[PDB]
């Protein structure tokens, strides 16, 4: 992901809180 959400992508990065 490219944000600081709750679900990670691979390293220390995460998806956005979009609807």
Curated annotation (Swiss-Prot):
Residues marked Important for stabilization of the lasso structure (site):
14-15
Protein name in UniProt: Astexin-1
- Domain comment? Is composed of a ring composed by 9 residues, a loop and a C-terminal tail. The peptide is threaded when the C-terminal tail is inserted throught the isopeptide-bonded ring.
Could you say what the effect of mutating residue 15 to W is?
Gain in thermostability
Its biological function? Shows weak antimicrobial activity against its phylogenetic relative Caulobacter crescentus. Does not show activity against other bacteria tested (E.coli, Vibrio sp, Burkhoderia thailandensis, and Salmonella newport).
Q: Which UniProt keywords apply?
A: Antibiotic, Antimicrobial, Isopeptide bond
Source species, please?
Answer: Asticcacaulis excentricus (strain ATCC 15261 / DSM 4724 / KCTC 12464 / NCIMB 9791 / VKM B-1370 / CB 48)
Mention one GO biological process in which this protein takes part, according to its record: defense response to bacterium
């Amino acid at each position: 992901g490219l944000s600081q959400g709750v679900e990670p992508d691979i390293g220390q990065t995460y998806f956005e809180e979009s609807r």
